[PDB]
Amino acid sequence: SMEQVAMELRLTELTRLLRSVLDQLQDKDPARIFAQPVSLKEVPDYLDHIKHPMDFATMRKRLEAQGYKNLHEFEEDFDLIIDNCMKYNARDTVFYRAAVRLRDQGGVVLRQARREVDSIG
């Protein structure tokens, strides 16, 4: 149907905007701490601690499959990156501190993304 196509165009455009958001957030992680999945070879107990691991590469795979239907779903995955790190790692660590900085800096990007998503529909 033409309606299904229009819906698909909307999803494609959301995907375009979320790709730009993802790029801007990942620039706030210049150490690449959150770039890839925590390695279960290197942290073999990780899944005993963290039940839903997340990282920027995994988000990008979902994004490119158009697997985010709305901004809320995308934000959920970004918050997992931060929140998983802040639980596994202690306050005095470069990992925790990186997550705090990513959260604080990302907030600004996400505030305007929400306005854009609502504005453009």
Can you give the CATH number for the domain in which 96 is found?
Answer: 1.20.920.10
Question: Could you tell me the residue range of the domain that residue 64 belongs to?
Answer: 1-121
Cβ neighbors of 66 (< 8 A, separation 6 or more) are 11, 12, 15
Q: Resolution of this PDB entry, in A?
A: 1.5
Tally of structural domains, the chain: 1
**Other C-beta atoms within 10 Å of 92: how many?**
7
Q: Given its phi and psi angles, is residue 67 left (phi above 0), alpha (psi -120 to 50 degrees) or beta?
A: alpha
DSSP character for 65?
T
Rg of the chain, C-alpha, whole Å: 16
The token pair at 82 is: 């931060």
